[PDB]
Design an enzyme around this catalytic site. Sequence first.
Site, PDB file in Angstrom:
ATOM      1  N   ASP A 106      -3.743  -4.013   3.869  1.00 12.44           N
ATOM      2  CA  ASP A 106      -3.525  -2.729   3.205  1.00 12.44           C
ATOM      3  C   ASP A 106      -3.884  -2.720   1.718  1.00 12.44           C
ATOM      4  O   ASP A 106      -3.101  -3.187   0.898  1.00 12.44           O
ATOM      5  CB  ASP A 106      -2.048  -2.343   3.384  1.00 12.44           C
ATOM      6  N   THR A 107      -4.993  -2.042   1.374  1.00 12.55           N
ATOM      7  CA  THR A 107      -5.480  -1.943  -0.010  1.00 12.55           C
ATOM      8  C   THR A 107      -4.625  -1.028  -0.885  1.00 12.55           C
ATOM      9  O   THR A 107      -4.721  -1.062  -2.110  1.00 12.55           O
ATOM     10  CB  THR A 107      -6.962  -1.478  -0.077  1.00 12.55           C
ATOM     11  N   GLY A 108      -3.774  -0.235  -0.238  1.00  8.90           N
ATOM     12  CA  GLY A 108      -2.903   0.689  -0.941  1.00  8.90           C
ATOM     13  C   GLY A 108      -1.576   0.111  -1.393  1.00  8.90           C
ATOM     14  O   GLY A 108      -0.931   0.712  -2.260  1.00  8.90           O
TER      15      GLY A 108
END
Lengths: 99, 99
Positions: B25-27
């Site tokens: 997850d890049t968020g």
Amino acid sequence: PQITLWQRPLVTIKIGGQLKEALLDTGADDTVLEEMSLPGRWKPKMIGGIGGFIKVRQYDQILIEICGHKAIGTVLVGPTPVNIIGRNLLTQIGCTLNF
Amino acid sequence: PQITLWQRPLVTIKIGGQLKEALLDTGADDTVLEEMSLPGRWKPKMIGGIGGFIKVRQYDQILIEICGHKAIGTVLVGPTPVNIIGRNLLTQIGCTLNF
Ligand SMILES: O=c1oc2c(c(O)c1[C@H](c1cccc(NS(=O)(=O)c3ccccc3)c1)C1CC1)CCCCCC2
């Protein structure tokens, strides 16, 4: 371009004539945005996050520009902490992960 | 390596000598894992997202193997609905986002 992850991967989006800021999130299946007005009719939906479920309004076939790239798909509107660009739109602009 | 986003980006990780599956997850700023036991001292914290805030236990300098690479960093343990690998570990194996 190429985006490293030392800081939040924020980008500018142009939707409905105005510019807004959003987070590129690979873990989300759908795109979620803050309370705004959009054309057309809508349908209801429930999505779960890390802290529970929220109810959202769903709009189909909306045009939205991300770093010069054009996409047309579904967008969800509701109480989110930041604007989120998910997998449904990341696939349209041909975005990938690399390590 | 290069990963497309037609499907969820799941990977297998090894922590505390136990196998687990997780979502890239890049968020997410940090890594958040489902309720499990870890050695050491920890500090309570609150992290928020879609739907509200959750209470977690923060451990520092934990070693983790992610798709063949070692990495060290903070790990948050609590009631998340799914295992998440955030930016603080993703940077350590040099993962980038490209389009
Ligand atoms: O809340 C979410 O729900 C989901 C996903 C997701 O990526 C988030 C994000 C998140 C994740 C981890 C920690 C924090 N909290 S934070 O402190 O790292 C943070 C806070 C504000 C802004 C960004 C990050 C926030 C929300 C910011 C958008 C997708 C993956 C699967 C889980 C279920 C859906």
